[PDB]
Paper text:
CASKIN2 and its mammalian homolog CASKIN1, are multidomain proteins that share the same overall organization. The amino terminal half of both proteins consist of protein-protein interaction modules, namely six ankyrin repeats, an SH3 domain, and two SAM domains. Sterile Alpha Motif (SAM) domains are well represented in the human genome reflecting the versatility of this compact, five-helix fold to facilitate protein-ligand interactions that include other proteins, nucleic acids and lipids. Using the CASKIN2 scaffolding protein as a focus of this investigation, we have demonstrated that its SAM domain tandem is able to sample monomeric, dimeric, and oligomeric states.
The structure was subsequently solved at 2.75 Å resolution from a SAD dataset acquired at the Canadian Light Source Synchrotron. A single SAM domain tandem was observed in the asymmetric unit. Despite having ~60 % sequence identity to CASKIN1 SAM tandem, we observed a different oligomeric architecture in the crystal structure of the CASKIN2 SAM tandem. In contrast, the CASKIN2 SAM tandem presented here forms a domain swapped dimer where SAM1 interacts with SAM2 of a second molecule and vice versa. The intra-SAM domain contacts within one dimer and inter-SAM domain contacts between dimers follow a head-to-tail type interaction that has been observed in many homo- and heterotypic SAM-SAM structures including, but not limited to AIDA-1, ANKS3/ANK6, Ste11/Ste50, LEAFY, Liprin-α/Liprin-β, Ph/Scm, Shank3, Ship2/EphA2, TEL, and Yan/Mae. While the SAM-SAM head-to-tail interaction is predominantly hydrophobic, ionic contacts serve an important role at the intramolecular SAM-SAM interface of the dimer and the intermolecular SAM-SAM interface between dimers. Specifically, ionic contacts were observed between D527/K610 and D516/K611 at the intramolecular SAM1-SAM2 interface and between H538/D585 and K540/D592 at the intermolecular SAM1-SAM2 interface. A hydrophobic network with contributions from W554 and Y558 and peripheral support from L555, together serve to restrain the linker in one conformation in the crystal structure. Near the linker, an ionic contact (E565/R618) from the SAM domains across the dimer interface further add to the compactness of the assembly. In the crystal structure, the C-terminal segment of helix 5 in SAM2 extends to G658 and makes contacts with a similar segment in another dimer.
Numbering used by the authors:
A (entry chain A), B (entry chain A): 21 to 160
Write the structure that this text describes.
Amino acid sequence: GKDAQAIHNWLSEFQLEGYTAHFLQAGYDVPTISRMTPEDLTAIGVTKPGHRKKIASEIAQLSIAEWLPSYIPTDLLEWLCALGLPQYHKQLVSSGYDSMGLVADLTWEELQEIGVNKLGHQKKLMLGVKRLAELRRGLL
Amino acid sequence: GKDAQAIHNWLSEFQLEGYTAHFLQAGYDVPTISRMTPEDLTAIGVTKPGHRKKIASEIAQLSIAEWLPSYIPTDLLEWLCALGLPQYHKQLVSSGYDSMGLVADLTWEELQEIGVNKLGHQKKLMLGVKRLAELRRGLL
């Protein structure tokens, strides 16, 4: 198991790791767990109040989000972080590409005065744009 | 370096790994490399014809795509693979959620006769739907 070893690690930091299989059988992984509620834990069989209280508390301390597991960037900076290019955010913003909907229409010739000059970052970004467009038209 | 060790590994499988820094300085990573052309390799300074011929050939043999690095799913199955839920594709298709644009309007009550019954897979999917909607309205 691959996310099992992520759960088992996190549950071990407070000696509740014998609940690992509870999250597995329910299909959960760590980022989804971070958004459960107490009733969700009850639903998957965490019924002992002493343990459900403690797992809830330990979940609020989980501060790793937000486009995991979905992998849908909602805003521009999230997306440049999916890609490995957050260093370009504020160049894109100074040039008026400050939203997903506007970035989708960015074009190969703007790139030089925005400041994306390494050709690999150039290509990676424009492939992201191209197929971001392909996803908008996907709604009809 | 993290994708450097991915390049250095792949270039080593044909003893050309001393080109690793060429791809780094240009910002490339493996999935972007897989889409380069010969002129792209020239541009980043792979100028010796014997090596550029061989790296090109070795790139066509790279068959790992397609939403990496972009992390924008273009079609429904890609997206259920971003998430860890491809086992549900054909249930979603038998129920008429066979595109991104239609999935974006899937709702919590359909889930039982589609066949998504593990609550963690339920939550993971509906978070993906919710924020997929949030991304469509993002285009105005």
